[PDB]
């Protein structure tokens, strides 16, 4: 046991030295040669009303028009962002939903929460009514986040510190991702759908592979539980949100933190983080009833959204970057552009 | 300017809004309370008796008493970090906290069960989300406590205790000790009650506590309180 611990410490020190050796120059020193981004003014266009409880999760469709949102009232609503019309209203058997996802093809929508069972709802049913298609059971903890890898397979994250890849046609977990010390809080799929990163309460983030099913690379640096995570549009980097009131950018090729976003007046945690289409701007939903915009290259507060009546819990940018939506515990969902 | 299908979609959206409003109005009538405590605290017996009067995850129990609908949620099986999902119950009406009274001298693999229960009660009551949520306390092991105190003294659990060995003084001391943990007496109150073989008494006490909480909420909603 002692020799194993000594070997682990030696490997950790070697990894630290290797990561430090690659830190030839910081992102700030390189990005200082370009002019800063001006004040970004985003005005609220549509106000999606209809929810009667706290908003906890939302996801944009591949068409950049439809979006699904989850609330503690137990009602999933698919909104038409261009007309503010509810496309569907799905009554959930368990109102304690905490995450939701929209399939890339737009034919299925998934959600989860304190029920420890991921419900897969079909929208293109011939019967004409949205009925639960599959119910993935097996998780010993609450579902923190879920994302559709493909129309056939789906990945889910539970509170038991282990993620599982479930096949829709089969219904049995094929790959089980283990290694997290803390409860995995959020997931984010890379553009190629080959690699995905996950944040846990142990302040670390780990890069996992789909086919291999092992921890490809681990990341650290946060002083608190990682609350949010999102892949950079290029697919070689990802930002992370945590309760210590700061965002940290990590690179999968450099294996270290690139830049840290923080401000003195900000002391509360972060709920959600999402990059824009080009990745030039970074949005992070803070607990102080508002969301701030950060310069991905200079860390300057390029701008801030007006704000909601309660904690901003979720947000997401369309696949075309035409607009960004922000959810809040005030039961309202606004789209900014 | 809306086309033939846009108007139909708007009408369908209005119908969905009406249905959602009706569901909210219907759901708002039922009371929402949270059940907490250890496994050996007797929560199972409470749930069983309440169901008679009327797998991993959280259990939701529905019952009605005196024309008042209740929704009880059990999160004991949720063996995960609570501070990351306990905030979901911010809008809960009350909290049912059960503690094993007779387990004062039992050991837990804090080392003592009563100390751990007090720590959990302090963490839940003084939580930032439950600043105004009332808590209902039940002692589901008073008979075992009476049967054991005659042989095993209470000083083993509370050395500082020096009162009489009778059951009345011990119960009063335990009640005072558990009540003193409420550091927010100005905004919230604790409803203590001793559970016994009789089951209707506990349901009536819960009903009275919920009625008081509903009165307080209604008085606050209209600006009076």
């Amino acid at each position, epitope marked *: 046991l002692d020799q194993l611990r000594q070997e682990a410490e030696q490997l950790k020190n070697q990894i630290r030295d290797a990561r430090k050796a690659c830190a030839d120059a910081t992102l700030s020193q390189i990005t200082n040669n370009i002019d800063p981004v001006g004040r970004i003014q985003m005005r609220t266009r549509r106000t999606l009303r209809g929810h009667l409880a706290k908003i906890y999760a939302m996801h944009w469709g591949t068409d950049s028009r439809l979006l699904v949102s989850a609330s503690q009232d137990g009602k999933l609503i698919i909104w*038409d962002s261009y007309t503010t*019309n509810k*496309v*569907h209203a799905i009554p959930l058997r368990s109102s304690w939903v905490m995450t939701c996802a929209y399939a890339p093809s*737009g034919n299925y929508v998934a959600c989860g929460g304190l029920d420890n069972i991921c419900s897969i709802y079909n929208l293109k049913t*011939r019967e*004409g009514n949205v009925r639960v298609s599959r119910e993935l059971a097996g998780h010993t903890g609450y579902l923190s986040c879920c994302r559709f890898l493909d129309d056939n397979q789906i990945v889910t994250s539970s509170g038991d510190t282990t993620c599982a890849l479930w096949d829709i046609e089969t219904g049995q977990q094929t790959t089980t991702f283990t290694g997290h010390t803390g409860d995995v809080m959020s997931l984010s799929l890379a553009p190629d759908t080959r690699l995905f990163v996950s944040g846990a309460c142990d302040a670390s983030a780990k890069l996992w592979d789909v086919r291999e099913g092992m921890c490809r690379q681990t990341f650290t640096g946060h002083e608190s539980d990682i609350n949010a995570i999102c892949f950079f549009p290029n697919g070689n980097a990802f930002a992370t949100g945590s309760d210590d009131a700061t965002c940290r950018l990590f690179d999968l090729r450099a294996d270290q933190e690139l830049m840290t976003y923080s401000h003195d007046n900000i002391i509360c945690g972060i709920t959600s983080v999402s990059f824009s289409k080009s990745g030039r701007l970074l949005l992070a939903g803070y607990d102080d009833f508002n969301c701030n915009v950060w310069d991905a290259l200079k860390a300057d507060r390029a701008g801030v959204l007006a704000g909601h009546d309660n904690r901003v819990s979720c947000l997401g940018v369309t696949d075309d970057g035409m607009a960004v939506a922000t959810g809040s515990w005030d039961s309202f969902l606004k789209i900014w552009n | 300017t809306l086309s*033939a299908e846009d108007k*139909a979609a708007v009408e369908r959206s209005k*119908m969905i809004d009406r249905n959602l409003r009706e569901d909210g109005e219907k759901a708002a009538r039922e009371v929402k309370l949270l059940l907490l405590g250890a496994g050996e605290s007797g929560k199972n017996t409470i749930v069983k008796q309440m169901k008679i009067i009327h797998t991993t995850g959280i259990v939701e129990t529905h019952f009605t008493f005196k024309d008042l609908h209740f929704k009880m949620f059990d999160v004991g099986a949720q063996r995960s970090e609570r501070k990351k999902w306990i905030h979901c119950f911010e809008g809960v009406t009350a909290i049912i906290f059960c503690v094993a009274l007779s387990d004062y001298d039992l050991v837990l693999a804090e080392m003592n069960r009563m100390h751990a229960s007090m720590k959990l009660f302090d963490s839940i009551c003084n939580n930032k989300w439950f600043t105004d949520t009332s808590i209902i306390l039940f002692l589901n092991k008073k008979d075992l406590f009476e049967e054991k105190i005659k042989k095993s003294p209470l000083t083993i659990c509370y050395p500082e205790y020096a009162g009489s060995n009778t059951y009345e003084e011990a119960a009063a001391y335990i009640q005072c000790q558990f009540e003193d943990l409420n550091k927010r007496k100005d905004t919230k109150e604790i409803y203590t009650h001793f559970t016994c073989s009789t089951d209707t008494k506990n349901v009536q006490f819960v009903f009275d506590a919920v009625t008081d909480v509903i009165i307080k909420n209604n008085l606050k909603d209209c600006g009076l309180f």
Partner: single-chain antibody
Amino acid sequence: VQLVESGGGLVQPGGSRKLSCSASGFAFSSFGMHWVRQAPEKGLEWVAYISSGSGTIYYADTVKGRFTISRDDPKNTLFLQMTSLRSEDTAMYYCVRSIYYYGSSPFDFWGQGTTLTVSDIVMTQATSSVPVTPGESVSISCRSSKSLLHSNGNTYLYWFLQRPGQSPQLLIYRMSNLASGVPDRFSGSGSGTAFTLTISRLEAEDVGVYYCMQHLEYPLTFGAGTKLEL
């Protein structure tokens, strides 16, 4: 999904009849319902419509005020009360579903219809009968008096195929989305008012009449009906 229509037969001009269509196998409540008649050797014609929950009821000018359409969601039955029947009213009335939302496909299912006998945007089709052997591509041209393209950025055009002894079947809706279950051989396009339905390779199942329909104005109209046969 199944629609069973009841009522009809020989009726007198001044008589009355109450058609009853029993719906089952789907969410009758959420779906809309239309009545479309088809006289012998004549194209389809829209009669009436009821929106979800009976919130909006529309009638055609040819039957406005004479016919009375009602809906019963709890029982899931569609009734059409006709107090007066002219000679031209003899036709088979088909019940059709219609649900309206982004990405929907209205008029996707058509009932078997019932035979009843008595004792606006204009849609035109260039060619009516185009004898062509199976395998060769076919093209059906269509023209509308008013531009069906709405400011929202989509065109409200529908194509229906009615085979001998079978109700019409939705091929393509909104001119750009292929209906579910229809082979990919069918393709449709247009520009403002000139629409064209192209078929890669004609087969035996394609034998039938193709009916074009516009959905820009609620007073729907159907074309003459292009018939294809080997």
